[PDB]
Design a binder for this molecule. Structure first.
Ligand code: HEM
Length: 153
């Protein structure tokens, strides 16, 4: 369970993301795909993309990054009270998309990497620790829902 102070560190960097969620989403999805190419294969929608340049030029990838980060932001703004937001997400990701917890760990790493690069002013060590805790909580709760839904993750 995060403290209020930790949540405030999370939300203060998220405020920066929200200056340009689209650009942040591009960087995060591209970092995920570059660092863990098997994750790209998981997206039938995107797996044709061959290069970072093609990724950057895809309007469709940009749209999806906005969707992803806005969903995550809505979860983070609940400060742990995210049951309602996690239900549909866990169901789609367990049963339609089939995303293992290890891949949610990979996107978490990509989020931390991009925030660390873009936001040294709001992403020092304590802030990164807080974000890690928030993403750990998200993954813990999603993995519990995966169980309940019949997916090992
Ligand atoms: C922070 C973690 C993530 C969030 C918040 C998130 C959010 C979303 C949202 C909101 C959608 C659209 C609605 C839905 O289907 O549920 C979606 C779709 C999808 N997600 Fe995620 N996602 C996350 C991580 C991942 C990861 C790590 C992968 C794969 C490695 C993945 C694969 C997919 C796929 C395949 C779709 C469908 C894309 C399409 O064909 O339109 N997601 N995600």
């Amino acid at each position: 369970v995060l403290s209020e102070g930790e949540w405030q560190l999370v939300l203060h960097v998220w405020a920066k993301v929200e200056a340009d969620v689209a650009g942040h989403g591009q960087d995060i999805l591209i970092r995920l795909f570059k660092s863990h190419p098997e994750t790209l294969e998981n997206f039938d929608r995107f797996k044709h993309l061959k290069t970072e340049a093609e990724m950057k030029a895809s309007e469709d990838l940009k749209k999806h990054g906005v969707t992803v980060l806005t969903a995550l932001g809505a979860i983070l703004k609940k400060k742990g009270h995210h049951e309602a937001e996690l239900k549909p997400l866990a169901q789609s990701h367990a049963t339609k998309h089939k995303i293992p917890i290890k891949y949610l760990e990979f996107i978490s790493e990509a989020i931390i990497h991009v925030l660390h690069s873009r936001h040294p002013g709001d992403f020092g060590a304590d802030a990164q620790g807080a974000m890690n805790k928030a993403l750990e909580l998200f993954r813990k709760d999603i993995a519990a829902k995966y169980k309940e839904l019949g997916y090992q993750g």
